Symmetry: D2
Subunit: 259 residues, 4 copies
């Protein structure tokens, strides 16, 4: 099943879509600068692009740690991004009450992995009618993803993306099961599956650029709707060379018939 996001077709047999941007919104000017770099790189390579950022860091290490611009200012920044670049955007939501005002502006709304079983958040997200990105928790198996999908379907929204971010592997470590992508496709109605390579790696001794590339290449080899990543996270200047490689592999894989 494909999902249309403005003029973008997202699907497991379509050219991969990049979901990329930054961890947290800090200011309008920095955001526009970072976004302009993603837009020019992706446009030249012919890769469909959706700009990603959080307006709030909800689970920071300290109560005193900087958390970002917040809802009202964050939505102002997203409105400016869409106006300036004409691209879709994606952000996460952590409270039911935020879903409607966020969905008015943001094309895709994201369910945080830690909140995937917050049933009132699922319902509030579903009711927006927006495209939803479901972050697969590290503690949930790929065959249990269908239970989250079921909830969104019972609540009347079928425009769902499934986002791999790795699986718990002993203490404080993650592994990405390359077979989990296929399990999700087979058991969740072939909804678009995307791969968050960045968060999949957060527990490895260097977020290495070579590591991220090997892991991204491996996952895309399984035939995926998209790649989800952050830069500052990959350094922003290496983005073009990274994406050249991803696109070469995706174009190859997508050109071969399924069987």
């Amino acid at each position: 099943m494909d999902i249309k996001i403005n003029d973008i077709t997202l699907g497991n047999n379509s050219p991969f879509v990049l979901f990329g941007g930054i961890n947290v919104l800090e200011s309008l000017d920095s955001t526009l600068q970072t976004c302009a770099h993603y837009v020019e790189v992706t446009r030249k390579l012919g890769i469909p692009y959706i700009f990603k950022a959080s307006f709030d860091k909800a689970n920071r290490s300290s109560i005193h740690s900087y958390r970002g611009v917040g809802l009202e200012e964050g939505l102002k920044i997203f409105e400016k991004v869409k106006a300036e670049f004409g691209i879709p955007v994606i952000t996460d939501v952590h409270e039911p009450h935020q879903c409607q005002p966020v969905a008015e502006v943001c094309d895709v709304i994201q369910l945080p992995a830690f909140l995937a079983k917050q049933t009132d958040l699922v319902v509030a997200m579903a009711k927006t009618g927006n495209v939803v990105n479901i972050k697969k928790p590290q503690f949930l198996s790929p065959s249990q993803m269908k239970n989250i999908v079921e909830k969104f379907h019972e609540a009347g929204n079928g425009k769902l993306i499934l986002c791999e971010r790795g699986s718990s592997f002993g203490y404080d470590n993650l592994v990405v099961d390359m077979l989990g992508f296929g399990v999700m496709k087979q058991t969740c109605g072939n909804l678009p599956v995307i791969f968050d390579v960045t968060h999949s790696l957060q527990t490895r001794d260097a977020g290495r650029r070579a590591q991220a590339l090997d892991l991204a290449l491996a996952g895309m080899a399984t035939r995926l709707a998209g790649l989800f990543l952050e830069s500052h996270a990959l350094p922003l200047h290496l983005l073009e060379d990274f994406l050249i490689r991803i696109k070469a592999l995706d174009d190859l894989i997508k050109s071969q018939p399924i069987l």
Copy 2:
């Protein structure tokens, strides 16, 4: 470090406290009936007991599963439980705005495992000044619990309980690391540690729950936590082992 909860002393060197009740509050009459059974069994054995229920469950198996009676009626029910039986009570909260009004009534407030890193909720819970039960997520290592504890401390509350519920073990299965109890004690200032045996098992039976409860309580724990006369036979065995363990001094040096 011990925590006093009315007349109960909760601590890793104290007789174990049982936390148990029902999943979701439905009515005063049904609640009182179930609570009266736990109270009668625990009184008969002399085991300190704290009644547990949810008034508004946000993590339900289905989206239209009953959440519970809700805040206003749930707190009325909890008041009546406390008045009738003279025991403390425990409930979970998932919205920051609920923490204050809940804490007026409920002796212990519980942080759901899935929300354990949600800073706004941790702060709102801390600020109640109530005793807080911190449910350990299945994805978190025992040495990371200190970071949650640190956030509660920054927010001004040190009356914290750590609740083990198992760890992710490949797909679906949970395993309980019996060494994790000691790691939490060592790194978190010897706060009371309790063992939620039920959740630890839902991914795997009475004989199982008994082996696993006994193994955990052998490590010297403040309490045992159950989720949704067999209860009596079970508690007799747990109390035997607890009484033996707690009567012996901790290992020399």
Copy 3:
């Protein structure tokens, strides 16, 4: 099912048996000294005891690392141990051809965890007719132990002990699933199950840790405990025996 090892009764409802000793045999004098200490401690506490050692270290970090005394000399030392102390002994075997000469001397022969799927070794061990200790590999689940047991039964030997040593948990770490003991008892005809606490901890082995883990496992009702280790052994065994006596005095439910 119980197993008789000379005058010792080994079984999951019998007083626990300690299997202990040293890693690798280095000399007669140092072996007799270590064995005498275990004997003195176990005798004064009233705990049945089987002396353990390897005659060959088959996994050395270096090709030039010292291997131990080897078969011929090792069996001489075991014969001296049995003669001086009148106790049973246990050793591992890594090659089929070693099984018969080792079994002439050693009461219990042990199948190393890495070799548990070496079918020719299983057969050669079974054909000795000796009591066998089957080390559960860290990569095998408890419900797969019945397949190893089946092989020994087909080869004509039912005097089998199942020995827990933990399960692989991420990279370079182990966890012990306390539910795995009950699985093995239920699926393998209630053969004696013992717990190797020492090898279960290789990857973490503090004294307080070893004690918590040993207590937790023995709380599930086991035939024995298997270890390599100011009076640490006696302090440890006093606690284990207290718990084992309590658990074994309660009827199975």
Copy 4:
């Protein structure tokens, strides 16, 4: 570091080499027929190919399941494969005593995963001077492979291949950590790394084997290790077309600096 195996170059920046064949040698005629099919398909696609089988399977489902034809007859069959097709062959050894007679005939000898820490076998294999395939145990982390390599190096043999077969993931399940390939290359001197997709999948089908094989080969590997009967033997060509496409793309691009 590359390894030459007769006229084949094996290395992490060379075209992938296929190691394939069957589980246990059972008969000469059937072995030759199977091998002929691998040969014809791989020659057609220009893929370097090494025929694999066990002559003495030591880890059997039952004690009386057939172990295979045994050493003497198994080596005769391997000699016939080499003579008829002019390709290298690979087999496993489980006992120190078997290392010499197997190494005299077989171009690669293989260290079974479960025996990977058995020092006497490692020494005996090393001393043959033969190319060695080291199967990574499911319980060993990728940064511990260097310790096995070290033992071979101490014993005088550096012609070593590292073979991924997955990692224990909870009970009875395996996961392949796609980052482990790079850890092995970085810590073990960039020895050839190959991927046993067949044994990596025991615990879970054709679509799965393909996804997993493609993912692994995307990380830039010296080879792919598989069995057929296990993959069905007639789908081999379609499978290898896909593997070869991806491998040719990857290998044609310079390593990222």
